[PDB]
mmCIF file of C-alpha atoms and ligand atoms in Angstrom:
data_model
loop_
_atom_site.group_PDB
_atom_site.id
_atom_site.type_symbol
_atom_site.label_atom_id
_atom_site.label_comp_id
_atom_site.label_asym_id
_atom_site.label_seq_id
_atom_site.Cartn_x
_atom_site.Cartn_y
_atom_site.Cartn_z
ATOM 1 C CA UNK K 1 0.113 -0.018 -0.017
ATOM 2 C CA UNK K 2 2.564 2.412 1.142
ATOM 3 C CA UNK K 3 5.063 1.691 -1.755
ATOM 4 C CA UNK K 4 2.121 1.918 -4.145
ATOM 5 C CA UNK K 5 1.307 5.538 -2.920
ATOM 6 C CA UNK K 6 5.246 6.337 -2.890
ATOM 7 C CA UNK K 7 5.422 5.582 -6.658
ATOM 8 C CA UNK K 8 2.139 7.406 -7.134
ATOM 9 C CA UNK K 9 3.608 10.359 -5.342
ATOM 10 C CA UNK K 10 6.825 10.529 -7.333
ATOM 11 C CA UNK K 11 4.473 10.251 -10.306
ATOM 12 C CA UNK K 12 2.405 13.166 -9.267
ATOM 13 C CA UNK K 13 5.109 15.359 -8.349
ATOM 14 C CA UNK K 14 6.764 15.256 -11.661
ATOM 15 C CA UNK K 15 3.430 15.675 -13.477
ATOM 16 C CA UNK K 16 3.137 19.059 -11.314
ATOM 17 C CA UNK K 17 6.835 19.572 -11.610
ATOM 18 C CA UNK K 18 7.502 18.873 -15.265
ATOM 19 C CA UNK K 19 4.299 21.908 -15.731
ATOM 20 C CA UNK K 20 5.665 24.135 -13.257
ATOM 21 C CA UNK K 21 8.973 24.276 -14.978
ATOM 22 C CA UNK K 22 7.486 25.661 -18.317
ATOM 23 C CA UNK K 23 5.296 27.878 -16.270
ATOM 24 C CA UNK K 24 8.315 29.227 -14.251
ATOM 25 C CA UNK K 25 10.407 29.867 -17.432
ATOM 26 C CA UNK K 26 7.270 31.862 -18.941
ATOM 27 C CA UNK K 27 7.485 33.865 -15.849
ATOM 28 C CA UNK K 28 11.439 34.568 -15.787
ATOM 29 C CA UNK K 29 11.888 34.711 -19.176
ATOM 30 C CA UNK K 30 8.907 34.955 -21.129
ATOM 31 C CA UNK K 31 8.741 33.293 -24.870
ATOM 32 C CA UNK K 32 12.067 31.569 -25.636
ATOM 33 C CA UNK K 33 13.827 31.280 -28.891
ATOM 34 C CA UNK K 34 16.943 29.913 -30.150
ATOM 35 C CA UNK K 35 19.766 32.507 -31.898
ATOM 36 C CA UNK K 36 22.015 31.414 -34.507
ATOM 37 C CA UNK K 37 24.648 29.919 -32.456
ATOM 38 C CA UNK K 38 22.084 27.265 -31.423
ATOM 39 C CA UNK K 39 21.352 29.043 -27.476
ATOM 40 C CA UNK K 40 18.331 29.600 -25.731
ATOM 41 C CA UNK K 41 17.656 33.433 -25.920
ATOM 42 C CA UNK K 42 14.658 35.666 -24.279
ATOM 43 C CA UNK K 43 12.774 37.861 -26.680
ATOM 44 C CA UNK K 44 15.704 40.556 -26.507
ATOM 45 C CA UNK K 45 18.336 37.867 -27.620
ATOM 46 C CA UNK K 46 19.554 37.549 -24.415
ATOM 47 C CA UNK K 47 20.727 34.091 -23.379
ATOM 48 C CA UNK K 48 19.170 32.221 -20.322
ATOM 49 C CA UNK K 49 22.719 30.011 -19.309
ATOM 50 C CA UNK K 50 23.592 30.408 -16.262
ATOM 51 C CA UNK K 51 20.099 32.020 -14.945
ATOM 52 C CA UNK K 52 19.144 29.212 -12.752
ATOM 53 C CA UNK K 53 17.371 31.174 -9.987
ATOM 54 C CA UNK K 54 13.721 29.589 -10.908
ATOM 55 C CA UNK K 55 14.598 26.314 -11.795
ATOM 56 C CA UNK K 56 16.783 26.019 -8.310
ATOM 57 C CA UNK K 57 13.576 27.087 -6.591
ATOM 58 C CA UNK K 58 11.472 24.383 -8.150
ATOM 59 C CA UNK K 59 13.778 21.737 -7.631
ATOM 60 C CA UNK K 60 14.080 23.026 -3.690
ATOM 61 C CA UNK K 61 9.921 23.551 -3.449
ATOM 62 C CA UNK K 62 9.117 20.078 -5.291
ATOM 63 C CA UNK K 63 12.234 18.010 -4.450
ATOM 64 C CA UNK K 64 13.190 17.252 -8.172
ATOM 65 C CA UNK K 65 15.959 17.526 -10.372
ATOM 66 C CA UNK K 66 15.306 19.628 -13.393
ATOM 67 C CA UNK K 67 16.861 20.548 -16.243
ATOM 68 C CA UNK K 68 16.117 22.900 -19.762
ATOM 69 C CA UNK K 69 17.352 21.419 -22.652
ATOM 70 C CA UNK K 70 17.969 23.458 -26.037
ATOM 71 C CA UNK K 71 17.414 21.547 -29.116
ATOM 72 C CA UNK K 72 20.157 21.481 -31.676
ATOM 73 C CA UNK K 73 19.451 19.577 -34.962
ATOM 74 C CA UNK K 74 17.624 16.052 -33.283
ATOM 75 C CA UNK K 75 20.115 16.633 -30.312
ATOM 76 C CA UNK K 76 19.182 17.895 -26.918
ATOM 77 C CA UNK K 77 21.850 20.200 -24.624
ATOM 78 C CA UNK K 78 21.652 20.864 -21.212
ATOM 79 C CA UNK K 79 21.641 24.422 -20.701
ATOM 80 C CA UNK K 80 20.118 24.767 -17.488
ATOM 81 C CA UNK K 81 20.265 22.129 -14.690
ATOM 82 C CA UNK K 82 20.400 20.886 -11.105
ATOM 83 C CA UNK K 83 22.120 17.948 -11.825
ATOM 84 C CA UNK K 84 25.385 18.061 -10.633
ATOM 85 C CA UNK K 85 28.743 16.107 -11.326
ATOM 86 C CA UNK K 86 31.208 15.072 -8.521
ATOM 87 C CA UNK K 87 33.164 17.845 -8.579
ATOM 88 C CA UNK K 88 29.668 20.158 -7.750
ATOM 89 C CA UNK K 89 29.529 21.572 -11.242
ATOM 90 C CA UNK K 90 25.860 21.561 -12.667
ATOM 91 C CA UNK K 91 26.105 19.358 -15.842
ATOM 92 C CA UNK K 92 25.509 21.994 -18.397
ATOM 93 C CA UNK K 93 26.674 21.138 -21.923
ATOM 94 C CA UNK K 94 26.053 17.291 -21.794
ATOM 95 C CA UNK K 95 23.141 15.911 -23.936
ATOM 96 C CA UNK K 96 20.537 13.694 -23.989
ATOM 97 C CA UNK K 97 21.030 10.187 -24.564
ATOM 98 C CA UNK K 98 20.456 9.984 -28.329
ATOM 99 C CA UNK K 99 19.719 6.177 -28.063
ATOM 100 C CA UNK K 100 16.799 6.635 -25.445
ATOM 101 C CA UNK K 101 13.212 6.225 -25.760
ATOM 102 C CA UNK K 102 13.102 9.828 -24.119
ATOM 103 C CA UNK K 103 15.365 11.065 -26.852
ATOM 104 C CA UNK K 104 13.051 9.623 -29.373
ATOM 105 C CA UNK K 105 9.807 10.417 -27.948
ATOM 106 C CA UNK K 106 10.499 14.672 -27.562
ATOM 107 C CA UNK K 107 11.905 14.235 -31.401
ATOM 108 C CA UNK K 108 8.048 12.852 -32.046
ATOM 109 C CA UNK K 109 6.879 15.666 -30.473
ATOM 110 C CA UNK K 110 5.744 13.805 -27.562
ATOM 111 C CA UNK K 111 6.176 13.595 -23.642
ATOM 112 C CA UNK K 112 7.755 11.172 -21.897
ATOM 113 C CA UNK K 113 7.310 10.035 -17.980
ATOM 114 C CA UNK K 114 8.984 7.064 -16.829
ATOM 115 C CA UNK K 115 12.218 5.826 -15.823
ATOM 116 C CA UNK K 116 15.349 6.708 -17.527
ATOM 117 C CA UNK K 117 19.219 6.511 -17.184
ATOM 118 C CA UNK K 118 20.883 9.987 -16.613
ATOM 119 C CA UNK K 119 24.738 10.339 -16.550
ATOM 120 C CA UNK K 120 25.259 6.845 -15.243
ATOM 121 C CA UNK K 121 22.353 6.561 -12.727
ATOM 122 C CA UNK K 122 18.491 5.527 -12.827
ATOM 123 C CA UNK K 123 15.786 8.227 -12.221
ATOM 124 C CA UNK K 124 12.125 8.687 -12.693
ATOM 125 C CA UNK K 125 11.606 11.337 -15.362
ATOM 126 C CA UNK K 126 9.677 13.471 -17.097
ATOM 127 C CA UNK K 127 10.687 14.885 -20.450
ATOM 128 C CA UNK K 128 8.421 17.518 -22.227
ATOM 129 C CA UNK K 129 8.738 19.710 -25.634
ATOM 130 C CA UNK K 130 9.717 23.401 -25.097
ATOM 131 C CA UNK K 131 8.275 25.427 -27.814
ATOM 132 C CA UNK K 132 8.716 28.880 -29.240
ATOM 133 C CA UNK K 133 6.124 31.550 -29.735
ATOM 134 C CA UNK K 134 5.433 29.899 -33.465
ATOM 135 C CA UNK K 135 5.041 26.420 -32.111
ATOM 136 C CA UNK K 136 8.188 24.970 -33.375
ATOM 137 C CA UNK K 137 10.028 23.071 -30.990
ATOM 138 C CA UNK K 138 13.401 24.843 -29.484
ATOM 139 C CA UNK K 139 14.146 22.479 -26.750
ATOM 140 C CA UNK K 140 12.929 20.608 -23.539
ATOM 141 C CA UNK K 141 12.080 20.788 -20.159
ATOM 142 C CA UNK K 142 12.665 17.710 -17.602
ATOM 143 C CA UNK K 143 12.228 17.042 -13.685
ATOM 144 C CA UNK K 144 13.403 13.969 -12.058
ATOM 145 C CA UNK K 145 13.664 12.043 -8.955
ATOM 146 C CA UNK K 146 16.210 9.320 -8.606
ATOM 147 C CA UNK K 147 15.815 6.015 -8.005
ATOM 148 C CA UNK K 148 18.235 6.119 -5.126
ATOM 149 C CA UNK K 149 16.132 8.807 -3.615
ATOM 150 C CA UNK K 150 13.098 6.725 -3.636
ATOM 151 C CA UNK K 151 14.506 3.945 -2.363
ATOM 152 C CA UNK K 152 15.543 5.781 0.429
ATOM 153 C CA UNK K 153 11.845 6.972 1.116
ATOM 154 C CA UNK K 154 10.819 3.452 0.735
ATOM 155 C CA UNK K 155 13.348 1.963 3.357
HETATM 156 NA NA1 NA N 201 19.435 4.413 -23.377
#
């Protein structure tokens, strides 16, 4: 019973947080676009990289990790993220695994909710397309909870 409750809580958290992230970006930046170099920019053409205040707040309040990807070609590059490597640096510049179903789902214009590996470890994830004012996909928003964190709750 409690295990199923925890699983449903994780899923509800991710559904809520994935849509909140899109709303947070709209509040922070307004509509986003890609510049010639393939970087996410606001209406003024100002790049968003390093402006992590809202995504950090979302991560803290919903207890998720979170990422905003830029779409370059069919690839998705982490632009804003709360995921960190062992040295404490945010994993900006890493890419979504091109062999995974989350990548295929996003390139097909869909959303992905399910388990996925990120940089070597397993997470429960939500990946949602990010669109510009014309409806064109310019990236993706992601929220996740590590399987390690889920197992810690269950124990
Ligand atoms: Na994979």
